[PDB]
Structures are given as structure tokens and as C-alpha cells.
Amino acid sequence: EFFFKKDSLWQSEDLEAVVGEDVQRTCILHGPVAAQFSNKVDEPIKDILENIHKGHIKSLVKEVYNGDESKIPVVEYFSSVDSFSDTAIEGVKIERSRNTETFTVTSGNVDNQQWFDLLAGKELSWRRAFITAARLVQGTNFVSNPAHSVLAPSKDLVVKIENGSDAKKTVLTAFQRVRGKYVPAVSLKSIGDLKIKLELIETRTADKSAVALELFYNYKPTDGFAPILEVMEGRNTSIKNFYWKLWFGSSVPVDLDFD
Amino acid sequence: RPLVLNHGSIESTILIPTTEYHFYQTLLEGFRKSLPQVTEGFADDDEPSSKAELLMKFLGYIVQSGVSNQQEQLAAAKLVLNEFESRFLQGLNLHSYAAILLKSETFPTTLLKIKENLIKNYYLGRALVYLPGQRGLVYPPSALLNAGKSGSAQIYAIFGGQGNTDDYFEELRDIYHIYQGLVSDFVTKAQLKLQELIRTTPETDRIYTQGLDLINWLENKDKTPDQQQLLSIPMSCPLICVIQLCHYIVTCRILGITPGQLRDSLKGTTGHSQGLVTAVVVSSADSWESFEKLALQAVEFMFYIGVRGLQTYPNTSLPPSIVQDSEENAEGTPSPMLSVRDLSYDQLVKFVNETNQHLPEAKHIDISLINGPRNVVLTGPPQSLYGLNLNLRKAKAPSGLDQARIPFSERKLRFSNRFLPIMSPFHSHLLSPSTEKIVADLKKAGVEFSQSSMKLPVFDTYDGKDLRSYSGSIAARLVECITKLRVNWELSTEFNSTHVLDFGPGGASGLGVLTHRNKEGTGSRVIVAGVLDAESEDSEFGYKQEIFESNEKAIKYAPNWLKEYKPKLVKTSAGKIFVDTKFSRLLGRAPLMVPGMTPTTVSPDFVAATLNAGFHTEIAGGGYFAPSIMKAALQRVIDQVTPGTGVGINLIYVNPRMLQWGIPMIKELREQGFPIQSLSIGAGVPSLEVATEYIETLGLAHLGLKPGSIDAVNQVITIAKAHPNFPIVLQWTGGRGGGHHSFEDFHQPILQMYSKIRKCKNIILIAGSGFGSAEDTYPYLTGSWSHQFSYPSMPFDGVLFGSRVMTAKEAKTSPAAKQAIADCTGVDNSQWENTYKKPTGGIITVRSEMGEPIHKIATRGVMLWKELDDTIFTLPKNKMLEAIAKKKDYIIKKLNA
Numbered sequence A: 001e002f003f004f005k006k007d008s009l010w011q012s013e014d015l016e017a018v019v020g021e022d023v024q025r026t027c028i029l030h031g032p033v034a035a036q037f038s039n040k041v042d043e044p045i046k047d048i049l050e051n052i053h054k055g056h057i058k059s060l061v062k063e064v065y066n067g068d069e070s071k072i073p074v075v076e077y078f079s080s081v082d083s084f085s086d087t088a089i090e091g092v093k094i095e096r097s098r099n100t101e102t103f104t105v106t107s108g109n110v111d112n113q114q115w116f117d118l119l120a121g122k123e124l125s126w127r128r129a130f131i132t133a134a135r136l137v138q139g140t141n142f143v144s145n146p147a148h149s150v151l152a153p154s155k156d157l158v159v160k161i162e163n164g165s166d167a168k169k170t171v172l173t174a175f176q177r178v179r180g181k182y183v184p185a186v187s188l189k190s191i192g193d194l195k196i197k198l199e200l201i202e203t204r205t206a207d208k209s210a211v212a213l214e215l216f217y218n219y220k221p222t223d224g225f226a227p228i229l230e231v232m233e234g235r236n237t238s239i240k241n242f243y244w245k246l247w248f249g250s251s252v253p254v255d256l257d258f259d
Numbered sequence B: 001r002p003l004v005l006n007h008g009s010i011e012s013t014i015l016i017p018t019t020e021y022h023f024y025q026t027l028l029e030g031f032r033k034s035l036p037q038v039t040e041g042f043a044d045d046d047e048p049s050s051k052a053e054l055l056m057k058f059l060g061y062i063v064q065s066g067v068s069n070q071q072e073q074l075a076a077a078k079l080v081l082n083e084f085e086s087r088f089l090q091g092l093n094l095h096s097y098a099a100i101l102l103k104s105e106t107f108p109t110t111l112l113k114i115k116e117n118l119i120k121n122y123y124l125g126r127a128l129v130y131l132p133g134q135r136g137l138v139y140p141p142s143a144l145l146n147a148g149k150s151g152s153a154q155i156y157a158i159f160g161g162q163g164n165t166d167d168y169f170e171e172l173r174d175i176y177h178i179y180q181g182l183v184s185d186f187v188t189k190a191q192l193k194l195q196e197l198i199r200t201t202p203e204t205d206r207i208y209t210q211g212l213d214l215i216n217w218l219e220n221k222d223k224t225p226d227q228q229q230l231l232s233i234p235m236s237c238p239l240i241c242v243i244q245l246c247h248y249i250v251t252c253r254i255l256g257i258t259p260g261q262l263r264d265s266l267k268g269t270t271g272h273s274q275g276l277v278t279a280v281v282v283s284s285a286d287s288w289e290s291f292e293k294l295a296l297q298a299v300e301f302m303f304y305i306g307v308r309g310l311q312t313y314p315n316t317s318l319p320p321s322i323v324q325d326s327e328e329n330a331e332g333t334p335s336p337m338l339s340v341r342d343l344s345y346d347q348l349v350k351f352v353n354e355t356n357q358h359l360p361e362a363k364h365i366d367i368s369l370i371n372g373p374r375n376v377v378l379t380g381p382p383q384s385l386y387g388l389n390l391n392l393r394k395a396k397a398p399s400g401l402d403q404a405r406i407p408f409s410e411r412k413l414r415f416s417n418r419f420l421p422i423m424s425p426f427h428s429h430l431l432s433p434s435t436e437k438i439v440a441d442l443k444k445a446g447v448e449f450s451q452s453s454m455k456l457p458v459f460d461t462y463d464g465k466d467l468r469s470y471s472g473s474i475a476a477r478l479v480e481c482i483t484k485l486r487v488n489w490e491l492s493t494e495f496n497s498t499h500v501l502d503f504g505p506g507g508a509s510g511l512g513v514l515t516h517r518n519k520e521g522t523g524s525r526v527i528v529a530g531v532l533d534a535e536s537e538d539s540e541f542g543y544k545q546e547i548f549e550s551n552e553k554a555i556k557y558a559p560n561w562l563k564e565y566k567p568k569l570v571k572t573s574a575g576k577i578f579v580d581t582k583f584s585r586l587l588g589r590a591p592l593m594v595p596g597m598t599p600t601t602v603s604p605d606f607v608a609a610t611l612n613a614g615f616h617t618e619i620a621g622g623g624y625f626a627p628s629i630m631k632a633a634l635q636r637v638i639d640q641v642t643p644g645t646g647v648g649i650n651l652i653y654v655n656p657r658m659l660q661w662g663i664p665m666i667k668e669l670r671e672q673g674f675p676i677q678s679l680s681i682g683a684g685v686p687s688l689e690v691a692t693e694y695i696e697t698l699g700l701a702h703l704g705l706k707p708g709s710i711d712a713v714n715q716v717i718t719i720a721k722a723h724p725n726f727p728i729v730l731q732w733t734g735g736r737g738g739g740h741h742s743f744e745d746f747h748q749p750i751l752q753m754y755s756k757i758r759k760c761k762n763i764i765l766i767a768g769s770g771f772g773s774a775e776d777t778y779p780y781l782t783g784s785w786s787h788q789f790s791y792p793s794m795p796f797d798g799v800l801f802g803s804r805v806m807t808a809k810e811a812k813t814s815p816a817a818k819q820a821i822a823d824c825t826g827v828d829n830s831q832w833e834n835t836y837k838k839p840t841g842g843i844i845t846v847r848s849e850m851g852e853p854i855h856k857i858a859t860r861g862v863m864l865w866k867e868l869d870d871t872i873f874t875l876p877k878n879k880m881l882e883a884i885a886k887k888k889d890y891i892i893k894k895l896n897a
């Protein structure tokens, strides 16, 4: 019984190995239901499974959308969206004054999951795909999302969204307090299209002028499980350009062609 | 000036009287000794445990222990009443404030403390103040009844019958104790309706031995007859009807409305057998005097049914070897009503017929009322109902039959039958002689209901028709529906209801929780309307605190499963239609995936082919034997797939050797950063402690689980309820369709566990077991698969394709084996259990390496595998070797060919 029933599944894969390439001596696992249609053999996997998917879509259109495609709830990208319907966050001073949204978090700890809902809300733009993303793709590498760290609600923090309920011209800007004064810590905007620019700014530098660490990202709405990808082709110089002007002056040019 | 009324550890309760405090100082000096001493944490029942329970039993002191004049008793009572109605409860009324007071961790009060100290003493203060109750609209806007009056919250009333509880009188004792000021105008006039008009002047009377002093029994539990005189029909039929009408008088008096003002806020209002009489007086009441003139008619109605129903079938005593036998074989006392539950109707129609044939025509057993598809009661003579109780005893499974590791071989059924606590054969031929005696007796008095002064409908129990559009005497129809006609409860309650009110005499055991599974997932919250019991964490039935609510947004609804989990469509802004499903929201792809199959999803060239197609899959860990080769195979998916996509990992639980490396390798890959997004545990659910090392330590996005049995599905829920924020994906695969079994039917356990699964709102439910086309699995996405079992829509969150994927182009199965799958013919979802006898189009089951009924295509190798299992491989140590030695020449010809 050891020699008979052991490692007997791979002969279906290559049956050049079996004696005379007989298929009747192999062991192919198959459930009894779902075998009465399979006459189409050596079919691509994008056609075996999309035709089940397109066959469901065609059956839902005539059923719950009355045979009309114009009643589908058109979205920008497709992923999970969580419910935080009532705006009752604990410590905040939300005001909306003619496309400027100041969100001075007052005291304690707010719900962070509710905080990022306010931080990018009521649309499906690049901003909601950035602040509420659960993953960042570092070139086939799922890491934690940076917006849950650079925009984590600390005490006395303040963000200012310019026209986030208007268009693609949204400029989110988080301010924080050093030496009693509000300085522009974090900035965030959409340069070009399908490209996001996140720049973290430090004000205490060598020559006492603020320098910004420009980090760029991709944004594909065709994936919703991970819609944000950091571009990495040139960010190691972008950090070295940042730390040059911060350690040394902005007077001396950034020199990387050393020996 | 302030005033303290402390007790032990709570000093905070401060009322503000006037400056004339000589009266208040001599008030509380008796109150300071009136309450018992501190039970080290307020554990006594006569002792106040909250800040409000001190103020209310102080009010209960100054009303019940009245020593001064009435001018200062009345003034001090409404001073405590106003400081309580403006500081503790504001806006919301008493039991809604007592709802949140009971579930208070910082003050551990219980139910008998909160009803005796708080609820009872409040309505004593509401009794000496506002004595008739004709003014002073301080009553809050009950938002459930307001929404039912105008809105999409239609309310239906339900009235119980008989046999819900054996001690029904302790409900009437309880409502007369707490609400003594409310239900006393009716109970003193129902007692003087019975004993003064119709018990002193019937034709003859030896059936009321102890009299019917009702008021004397409620305040003195030593004058109450004990439990068998009370269950007797002459003083159980009027007394159950008093209990239901007292629950309707109390509910109309907490809200301060008339019975005709609660009437327009609902519709429907049917009853079971005994409560259909209560269903007419509710639907035809108009005012507080149109009610009482009509509520006493329903008492005089049920007096004649109880009296004449005993004179045509009197109670009898059974042999005590019959009674002691049934009481020790897990039933009750043999009574004329026996309730068979969880047995299908076409099986107990022949279990009755195989007992009725050995019996005379008079001693027949009739199916008297059908409460549901698996819930009927039977009715005959009690010695004859003990007849089929012995027949049912030989077709019942014991507690350890184990048709869960054994397939459907034994024909032992898992049901339960028990005798109801009813002392008369209702809805049978045994009581139908007492009909023309009653109709000619209701015609002697004015106990004919009007049939046109009822404004709500009343659904008949026999055929479900409305009683407003019924020609004939409606009182003569009501005795037909109790004495002889079968209660057909399913089509008597085939209405569309958002909430259902049960003023039953059972409370937490009445018609609400009894017929609860009849309308489980169609969005009808049943509200028991007689008991408070604010502990309600599960959401299958409400309580009396949900009749009234101040705000509209605290109305708890019921889970309409079709409405919540309906598949929808979404279109991106590039022209890509998805199917909006709870599983498809998790992946951002289509709701259909491919599991971790051992010979065919082991190749990285195929796993990457079905990931580029836009579908989820998982590379199986069964075909890998060391973490270095598996990590090099996981990487080989990531090269030939576009960046941003993830993989899944299927690890098998029944070898710890694969979990020796597999669980660490995922942890070393995730913290270094790798697109592994999922982990399914095949062939067994891990225990709760070892599961949280997979959720917390590994960086997975969602955990897959494949429960096979019905305890594993319960075991998944204890992992899901341990942390509700992680997407635990439940992959349900039955016996059919798979490469292995779950040993049971496919859609029998999820027909019972769909309600438990959907309460966990992080469990994603995925159907398996052999799907292969769009029309094959479309009843499973929409929920129209359970329609053929008289069940509601139970829709799935996506499905998964196993053996249908094996003949793909990129699948690494060989082309001679691909056509061997196509020439194999399939069976339907029903006749899959004939695999261990015959080839079902070319598929049998054999034992596994460790021993599992693994499905295979019936080729010549598997027919040899099957033959050696049933001739050699399932033999002992000693006997195997000579069966080898006998057929050694025969086996070798089979192995070589």
C-alpha cells in the first residue's frame, strides 16, 4: 500500500513518463457534477472564465437593469468602500469655506479609519485611491500605504484641501507646528494625469530654508486591489537630492559624480 | 435647597425640594430604614443598585407608605416624578431608559431588580398623579408605530394560542404585579364578567371547583390552584385571552393612546387558534370604551369554548407506565396535542398513516395545525398519540449515530417530538361535536361580532382569507376555526411585514420564536410585546422596548438577505462591467476564482495565466516539498505577471510537515515585501488559537477557509467573531464536485447555517462543488437555489471553478488526459452519492493515501485502485498477506497492464 498509493498525481501532467502513454492507467481527479459540456478542449483561460462572467453580466442587465446599460452605477475605479456616513468625528474642527477645507484635529486620538475617510471623501478620484489604499506597490512589492503614516492624525495637526470636491486640481497640504508656528509639512497634488506627487517638507535645514522630498506615484484605475504604484526609476537620487540640500547648503550644487 | 437619599455606596441621587423641609425630613427617616442593608455590591433584589433605582423606590415609599395628608402625598410624589422625568430620562420614556439601564457594566443590575424597583414604582407615581389619565401629553413619539402609521414600516399583530408555556398564570401574575394600576379596571371587570354572569348561571357547573376568584389569586400565590386545574380548558381559555388583552391594554397605556389609535398604525392582526378571537377585538376596537365592551365579549366567547369543550371530551388519566415511559424518554406528560418538529411533512404523513390503520375511526390522529414546513403538531387521543410516539422512537437517531463521517447509509432521522401542554384536542374530530352547542349558546347572548366594524383585516387560520370579506356569522366561523378546522399558519401569515408584534402568552416562547424560522431571511423582525428582557445581543427577535423609541434611527430591522446580498453591476469609466458582489469588492476582480488544486495549479505558468486573465487563483502547496523550491515557484509567477497583482497560497492542514515550512515562509515573504495576498487552509479548519497567528502575524489580505462539516462552519464563525475586521473567506464545497468530500449533502448544512454565517459581516461565502457555466451557477449568485426547498433567497458572494478549469490551454495536464475529462459525462446535483457503488459516467471514489473518499475519473488504474481497496487494502495485519499471496499472480497482471 505504500508503493501503490503514493505520489500518484503527476502522471496526468506528463504521460510520456507512463508506460506506452496510456491515459487509462493514470489517476485524474474529477468531481461527478460538471462534466457534460467540456467538448471544447484546449480553450484559453481568458475565454473559459470571462464567458461565465460575461454570461452573468448579460443576465443581470435584462433582469435588474431592465435591459439598459445606461442605468449601471458608473464608477472611476472599482474596489471596496467602507461606510462612515455621518460626520461625527471626535476631535476635529472641520470647516468648509468656499473651496478650502481646514481640518484642525483638536485633541486626543480620533478614529484613524474615520480620519482618512474625511481626508479623501465623497468622490472616487485619485485622492480617495491614495488615502484609503491598503497597499502600495514598490515594483511587485506590497508594502504599507505611506498616507497612513505621513497623514496620521497627531495632536495639533492641520490639513487644508483646496478644491477636493471640485476637480483634478486638488492640492492637499498638511501643516504642523514647529517652534509654535505652522509650517507646510506635507503637500500632495496630481501632476499631469495618472501621476501623483507627494512631497514631504522639512524646514529645519542647514541654510534655514525648507526643502521638499518629491516622491511620485502611478495611479491605475484598472486595478482596485492595488491602484497606487510608486515609481522607483529615479527615487534614490530624489532622496539624495533632498539630503544634499538639507545637510549641506542650497548654495553648493548637488554633486553625485564623485569617484 | 438639596436633599440626599443615599444607600450605601451611591450618594449621588439629589432631589431639590422646597425650603419647607420639615415634611421631607420626616419623610425619608422612615425611608432610610425601609430599604434593606447593603449586599456588598448590591446583590439583593429588594435593594437599589443604580442612581435611579434609589429615586424610584423613594417614590414607591411615599405613595405606598402614605402617612400624611393627601395634599402633601400628591405634591411630594410629583416632585420626585418631575426630578426623575427631567434628569434621568428626558425625551425617551421609562422602559427605553430601562433598556440601556439593564445593559450597564458600571452598575450590574438584573431584570427582577429593574422591574420591581424601577418599572413598578414609576407607574404607582403615575397612578396617584393623573388619576384617570385624560390629559397631560408627556408621552413621547414612539417611532416604530409612527413609521408604521405613515411610512415603509408596516406593522402586523400576532396573538398566541395555547401550549406555549405550562405556567401561563405566572404571566398574568407578573403583569398584574408590575402594572397593577394599568390592568386592574379590566381584570376586576373580567372576573366579575365570568363569575357573576356566566359561572353562577350556566346550565350546570362542577368543573370550577375552587371558584374563579381571579384577583385573589394574583396577589396571593398560596390561593392559586396548582398547574393542572389552571391548564384545564374551562379556566385556560378565558385566562389566556385575558393575558393577551392585558398585553394590549398595557401597550396602549405606556404610549397614552387609544386602542383605535394603535389600530391605524398597523394591519393584519391574526391569531393562532385561541388568539384569533383576540385578533377580532383588536381589529374592531375604536376607543377605550368600545374596547372594553368588546373585550368582555371575547372573554364570554372563550368561556363557552372552554366549558363546552370539556363536556364533549373530558380530561383523562393515563396508565402510569405510559406516563413514566414518555416522561423519561425526553417527552412530557401525554396530552392530546403532540408537536413533531424538524421532520418533513411527507414523512410524518405516513408515520401517522401507519399508526392510523391499526386504530378505529374514532381514535384517529389528525395533523391539527401546520406552523411551518418542519413544524406541525398532531392531535388525537393521548393514548393514541403515544402510539406513533413509539413508532417514531424506532426511526430516531441517537446522539452518537455519526452520519457525518459516514455517508447516507443509515436511514435514521434527526428530529424531535414532544407533547404540548394542552389538555384538549383542538382542531380535530374529537372536539367538533361541541360546535352547534356553542353557536346556539353564543346566540343566547350578544356575543356575535359585527363583521363590518372591524377596520383592519383579520386573516383566517384555515385558508388565509380575510374575515372582513366573509359571508356568514363571524362568531360562528371563529368556533369552527378552533374546534374542527386545521390552522394553516403559512398561508395565514403570507403577508409582507417589516415588523411583527406578538402579544403572546408565551413571551420568549410564544408564537414569535416558534414560527421565527418560517420567515427568517425576508426582513420581518418579530417583536415580543409582553416582556422587557433588555439583554438581546443576537438579532432574531426583539423585545417590548422596541415597540416605542423616540428617534426614528434606532429602529432595528431584520436581515432581508435578498436585498442586502443582491448581485449588482458596476461600470468603470473605461467600459468594464463588473458584478458588484462582496467577494468581487474584496479582490477588485470578477466574483469567480480558481482554488488551489494539487496537480494542475502547482505550475507557475498556469497560475500566472489565470491571474493575467483578471481572476483570482492560488498556487497549491501540495506539490511542493521544501520552502526554497516553492519560493522559486512563487517568484516564477511574479516574473510573467504584470506588477501590482497578487497570488494566493493553498496549504493543506492534514499534514503538519507542510505547515512546518509553509507558515514561516509566508511570514518571511510578507515582512520582506511580497505580493502574496491570500492564504487558504484546505482540508480542515484550524483551531482558534492557531488561526490568529495567521491573521495577525502574516501580512495577508484575506484568509481562505474550507469547512467540510457543520461544526467546522461553526468553528469558522468563532474565528470570524474573534476579530470582525478581517475578511475571512468561507469556501463551501459539498460532497459532489470536488476532488475530496465533505461527506454530507452540499446544500443541506448551508440551508441551516446561512443565518449564522451572514450575522458575521466579514465572512464571504463562496459556493463550489462542480460548477461549469454561467447558467449553472447563476441560481447561486442570486439566491434562487434555495427556492426549491421552501426557503428564502440565500445568495452567495461569488463561486469557484475547480475541475472545469482542468482542460484549459495553459493547464499543464496532458492532452490525452484533457480529452479523458471531456468524454467523462457528468451527473446532476442530486445523484452524486452513487459514486461508491458504480461509475457515474466515468467517476468513482477510492480511498486516499491516509484514507479519504477521493474522487477520480474511473479509468483502468482507478478500477484497480478501487478493487484493491475492497479486497486487500482494508484487511487486518494478518489476513492481508495471504490475500496478497492468493492473488499475487492476478495482481501482477493488473499492475503491468
Ligand SMILES: Cc1cc2nc3c(=O)[nH]c(=O)nc-3n(C[C@H](O)[C@H](O)[C@H](O)COP(=O)(O)O)c2cc1C
Residues within 6 Å of the ligand: A028, A029, A030, A031, A033, A034, B595, B596, B597, B598, B599, B600, B620, B622, B650, B652, B681, B682, B683, B706, B733, B736, B737, B738, B739, B740, B768, B769, B770, B771, B800, B801, B802, B803, B804
Ligand atoms: C484535480 C483537483 C485537485 C484538487 N486539489 C485540492 C487541494 O489540493 N486542496 C483542496 O483543498 N482542494 C482541492 N481540490 C478541490 C477544489 O478546491 C474544489 O473543492 C473542487 O475542485 C470543486 O470542483 P468543481 O468546481 O468542479 O465543483 C481539488 C480538486 C481537483 C478537481
